[PDB]
Design a protein around this nucleic acid. Structure first.
Ligand code: ADP
Ligand code: MG
Ligand code: MG
Ligand code: MG
Ligand code: MG
Lengths: 228, 320, 186, 320, 320, 156
DNA sequence: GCAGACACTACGAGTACATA
DNA sequence: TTTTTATGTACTCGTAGTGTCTGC
């Protein structure tokens, strides 16, 4: 099998979720944070022709950056990984799929509860600002029938009170009150526009980011509030 | 059957580790106190400490989370340094369990000295996240848990059963072993050997199983295997007789014979002289053997140091 | 210093408001002030037979043990806690001493040796050079000083006084005075 | 009612954490010293230290803030490093208040060792920023707070109540426990039980409530549960009783029982004999046990070497 | 041969280290208990401890892995500090053995005191990786292995063969030596010398080979070499004569002579004084030598501690 | 007779070059020649205890007479991490010249050395082909048994 | 293309612990 | 009127020096 700068790209991303990854034969890759805070899944170009466990995902993505695009990835006769570049050959380990934290099946979202979208451009403006503004916690609520995001700094106001930042996401059509609170630490997804499906049942709830390329599902936090 | 098998493993004291809280062999009040919890449906903070290993702590930690359907994160205590708490443990605890499950962090074997600072950072953490998430701690030695942490936890103390519980718990293990035998294909010719395994290393139910593993070499426990478990390799009659007669040439000769396992022989001696000698000579024989035992292993020539015990006895010991 | 009306701000305000953390650093460092060691309150409790005030505190089995070693009258019970000290409750160790050392009094001064650290140097530099230990290194100094005046040996060896070696011998500028002294009168 | 319930949490010693400064059970002078502060309206620099855990320190901090309607930053002491003090702590102090609200910074559990630099750094932060905000510090061991801070701060020591403050404070808590039983739906059949919990744990109100949780398993506090709370600790009673009686058959039998963790058992022995024996027998028990401890691990048979300790004690130890 | 030769080395007690578990000279039940394992085809956790060196532990560790076709990692215990476990050992154990082999980590000579904390981190590790991977530990002194680790392991104890095994095992070694001779070109003129080597230092099969190396100086073992091996001294006459005469200058001089094997010399002394001294001086000589023997190996200067024995004797021993 | 012409101390510049120059008793000289005969050295412990007998000299000699590539180290200096870093850097290394590597440790019967001595148990085995160790002792018992097992113990 | 900015490494100082 | 033993190991903090990724 052969991996493309497009997919080597989508993986450096799943490295910010789990240091390792489980990939089974196919066009589809999933991973989940060890502590279950984040779940990613995607369908890909390059085709995955054998199963394997990768303990180091980000360091092997580092070693595949040193060969040519034409390089042929195969299971090694000796069961590890052989990367054959044209003039060269590299040997990288496999761990057993016990020490890498795989989800079982590709967790399907429920019927959503509310839905909005976000433009690629406006994701940039959030992440990039959070650093400066020290926005470590954000909240999706409604304002004037129009859903806004809100940045806060949780250490400064533990209460999510002085809202340091806000971005209006689109019109809110239905009728419900909600404050969903997401830890900036779980936002691991790559940039671009996402359809946003969030769901809540009492002390239940979750937020799915549906991208063009891969899907992302992020846990809410416990002070999150709503009637649904 | 009623027993759990992990079937993903061969090591047998780990193949049979209990799935639920009912399977665990526990003192009366300790079981009751756990069933109670599994009821309330939410788990408080809990410390489970041995200090004798293999009493079920790390099993019950995993158990409780199962019986409550916890959303659980298991952690090696010694891997649990401070920045671990800060990043992953804190992410986990701040995460909304979205299917409405108790979040529980099991920190196994947390009693290392080095982890003090991590445990300190933890003291304000367990308070901030107490609504969402709770912590179960396992330790061999409590004093390695800073006091402020024992305040915050229900401290349950394993392996100190009452005289009544010991007897009952053992009886429960003999049955539990028997049912393992049925499962593994080991056949029991004499039951006395299953009982003797349980009694021999009691407090610890792990080595109690892995002792059954290694005495099953031949696939049967017969009254022969019983000899090794209880092991008395003994005929001490030759020494006892020479001590009565207060001679040396004979004692001096027997010393190099028992130089082999001194630890065992000293036992079989204290055992059989205790009955055969006078009451105030009993208080002495312990002073005499007890001292000889202490300094063994400092003693250069074991054979000689054994002779010195024989002379010491023949002189002061008295009986008919 | 312009503007000439500035309500002189304290050392700290200047630092913090302007944000140069090395100023903040000299400022904080100002509070360094490090001593503590209430050890003698425990020790004096054991001498003068008074109220314990312990296990709430930090006890050095070695501090105590050693402090008491100053007085020949204690030795029997300091010694006892030596052979037997390891594996006694930090508290047990304190309960024993209290039930052991009978009278009480002590004034401070502990015993230390005289170090001609001229002479300490010459010995460690023989010990290093020849990979022999200290007692032999001694014999060395004597048969050199006695015969061969050992200026030569001091002459050839001076080459390595490596200033790190100096870190082993004494702790201060007296060290930098030796640096010169062995480089001198050979 | 008069009681606070957090209702967002199930862990019950945290469901009932007091809201104001009145709700708290504190010694006379201290409680007043606290009202007096919330009167003059602005909060001075305070350090609150137990060292017994759960005396109200971190609660009394959160309260002073509620009672001043203060703008508060609650920080984990172990999280407060040099860059925090430079960072979001200065960010906070220097940024502006139009609410006319006392700006208070709660540094909870600040007693760690490596924070020496963060501490020296704060003591200066205080001189530059003192007039914007104020700082409340929670600690268990004060010694872990650099001396230059204890200086600039009002230092109030919880946990050491007068003899009358012991008597009233417990009354106040017996009352408080009963009230929690009203809400949680626990029935009190015998009250001597609620007094037992409080006396037994006294300096520490956190475990004091927790123990209310674990003993409500059935849903009533009755005359039988009295017997459990009150019932007399240590299980070294069997050996201590056999040593008094100076017999052997019994001691000889107990030896193989504690052969398991010898290191722990020798501790619990030195601990509990020290009180139960005469003063010059104290000097001997250390010689006897201290030696037995030294040579353990040289000793071949641990069980026997433990017996030799028992005999040695029964002879020389005397007491009533 | 039937014998393994490493051929990459000259040091001969290491050229001949047994390849398989059958080659090893082991007590009846210990062999059986290993063959049993090599069958099940998976290895449990195992501790193999001497404390007499060169009984076959480190050989059997390597053996078992061979007879099972383990995928093995060998490690110096003292190099085995905590961050080693964390990085390499943990990488190894988490690695899928892809050809389907048992993974086994042999931690040789793990009984250092300093490694306690590493062994503690290990207690939760051996449980997490138990399906894939197992640990074999070698130690000279068990007490240097924390109890929770002995719980997790099958603890097999070397060098305490039964009276029966000793005899068998020796017979096996005499054959094993003979076959080494054939291989090295040493010729045996008298067999009595091969038997005497084995008996002389028995428990230890290493110095037993390296004694064969150094008595082969002349390339034949004749009844002359037999003299040196069985030799010892027997010439205790010089000391016995100086003790009668009650002088010092001479005794003080003889001490450094016998400082070499103290254990032997103390034997030959008790043996030959027992006949040459008065009956109530016999009871004392044992007290005197018996004590001197106990504390040897605590004693700093062996030579001096031997002098202190001579003086002690010359004074109290009275006889013609 | 050998002279080391850059040295200033008698005993250090007249130290016997060969296993011959040394003055020893009978089975001593035989047993030494018998050893250098085999051209590779085993592990060895040498002890007097009556000092100034030639312990430390006979070691540097046995090395010489085998054309051993010899690293001399004082015992007092042989700490745990000395062993780890250099002495391992030494015995791990192959030699160009293909000689036997040998490590003399003079007077290893000192005190703190105790934990080091335990490190060697599994070291002296792990490079047992490359190199071997010669240990000097005034008192043997100050050498832990598991070393006495690995070594041939000759007594002067 | 560089220079600037961010992130990750390592060493030094401090601290605490256990065995001799 | 006081005042710090030796040897090994582990965790955390702080800073400074190294890198790579990025922006005129
Ligand atoms: N057997 C010997 N023959 C000749 N010189 C000797 C002998 N033993 C010791 N010496 C003298 O002692 C010096 C070194 O002694 P050394 O081997 O260090 O003794 P030790 O090993 O007992 O410390 C040598 O220079 C040598 O001349
Ligand atoms: Mg466990
Ligand atoms: Mg608190
Ligand atoms: Mg070995
Ligand atoms: Mg020398």
């Amino acid at each position: 099998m052969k991996l493309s700068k497009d997919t080597t790209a989508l993986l450096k991303n799943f490295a910010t979720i789990n240091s390792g990854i489980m990939l089974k034969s196919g066009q589809f890759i999933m991973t989940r944070a060890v502590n279950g805070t984040t779940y990613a899944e995607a369908n890909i170009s390059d085709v995955i022709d054998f199963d394997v466990a990768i303990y180091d995902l980000n360091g092997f993505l580092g070693i595949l950056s040193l060969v040519n695009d034409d390089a042929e990835i195969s299971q090694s006769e000796d069961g590890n990984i052989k990367i054959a570049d044209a003039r060269s050959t590299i040997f990288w380990p496999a761990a057993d799929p016990s020490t890498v934290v795989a989800p079982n099946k590709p967790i399907p979202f429920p019927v959503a509860s509310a839905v909005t979208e976000i433009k690629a451009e406006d994701l940039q403006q959030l992440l990039r600002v959070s650093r400066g503004l020290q926005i470590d916690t954000i909240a999706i609520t409604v304002k004037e029938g129009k859903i806004v995001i809100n940045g806060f700094n949780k250490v400064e106001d533990s209460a999510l009170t002085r809202v340091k930042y806000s971005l209006t996401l689109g019109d809110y059509d239905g009728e419900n009150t909600f404050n969903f609170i997401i830890n900036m630490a779980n936002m691991k997804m790559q940039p671009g526009n996402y359809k946003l499906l969030l769901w809540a049942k009492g002390k239940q709830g979750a937020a799915k980011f549906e991208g063009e390329h891969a899907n992302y599902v992020v846990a809410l936090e416990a002070d999150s509030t709503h009637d649904f | 059957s009623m027993i759990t098998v992990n079937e993903k493993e061969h090591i047998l004291e780990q193949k049979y580790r209990p799935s639920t809280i009912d399977e665990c062999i526990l003192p009366a009040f300790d079981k009751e106190t756990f069933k109670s919890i599994t009821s309330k449906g939410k788990i408080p903070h809990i410390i489970l400490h041995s200090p004798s290993p293999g009493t079920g702590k790390t099993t019950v930690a995993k158990a409780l989370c199962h019986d409550v359907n916890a959303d659980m994160m298991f952690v090696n205590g010694s891997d649990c340094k401070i920045d671990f708490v800060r990043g992953p443990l804190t992410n986990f605890a701040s995460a909304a369990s979205f299917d409405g499950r108790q979040k529980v962090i099991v920190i196994d074997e947390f009693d290392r000295s080095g982890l003090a600072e991590s445990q300190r950072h933890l003291r304000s953490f367990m308070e901030a996240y107490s609504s969402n998430c709770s912590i179960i701690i396992t330790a061999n030695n409590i004093d390695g848990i800073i006091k402020p942490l024992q305040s915050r936890c229900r401290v349950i103390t394993f392996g100190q059963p009452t005289d009544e519980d010991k007897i009952e718990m053992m009886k429960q293990m003999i049955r539990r072993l028997t049912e393992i035998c049925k499962h593994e294909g080991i056949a029991i010719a004499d039951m006395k050997v299953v009982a003797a395994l349980v009694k021999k290393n009691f407090p610890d139910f792990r080595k109690t199983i892995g002792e059954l593993d290694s005495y099953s070499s031949k696939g049967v426990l017969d009254a022969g295997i019983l000899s090794l478990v209880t092991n008395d390799r003994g005929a001490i009659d030759d020494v006892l007789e020479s001590l009565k007669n207060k001679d040396v040439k004979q004692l001096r000769a027997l010393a190099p014979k028992y130089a082999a396992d001194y630890s065992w022989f000293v036992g079989k001696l204290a055992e059989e002289i205790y009955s055969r000698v006078t009451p105030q000579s009993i208080i002495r024989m312990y002073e005499i053997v007890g001292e000889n035992n202490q300094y063994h292993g400092i003693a250069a020539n074991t054979e000689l140091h054994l002779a010195y015990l024989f002379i010491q006895l023949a002189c002061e010991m008295q009986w008919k | 210093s312009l503007f000439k009306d500035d309500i002189q701000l304290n050392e700290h305000q200047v630092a913090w408001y302007s944000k140069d953390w090395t100023a903040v650093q000299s400022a904080a460092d100002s509070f360094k002030e490090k001593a503590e060691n209430e050890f003698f309150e425990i020790i004096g409790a054991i001498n003068n037979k008074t109220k314990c005030s312990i296990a709430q505190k930090d006890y050095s089995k070695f501090m105590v043990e050693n402090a008491l070693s100053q007085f020949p009258e204690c030795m029997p019970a300091v010694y006892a806690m030596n052979l037997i000290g390891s594996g006694l409750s930090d508290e047990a160790h304190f309960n024993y001493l209290m039930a052991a050392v009978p009278r009480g009094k002590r004034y401070g001064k502990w015993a230390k040796l005289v170090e001609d650290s001229t002479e300490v140097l010459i010995i460690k530099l023989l010990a290093k050079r020849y990979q022999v230990n200290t007692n032999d290194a001694i014999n060395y100094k004597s048969i050199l000083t006695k015969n061969g005046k050992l200026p030569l040996v001091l002459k050839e060896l001076k080459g390595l006084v490596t200033d790190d070696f100096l870190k082993e011998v004494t702790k201060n500028v007296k060290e930098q005075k030796q640096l010169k002294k062995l480089a001198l009168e050979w």
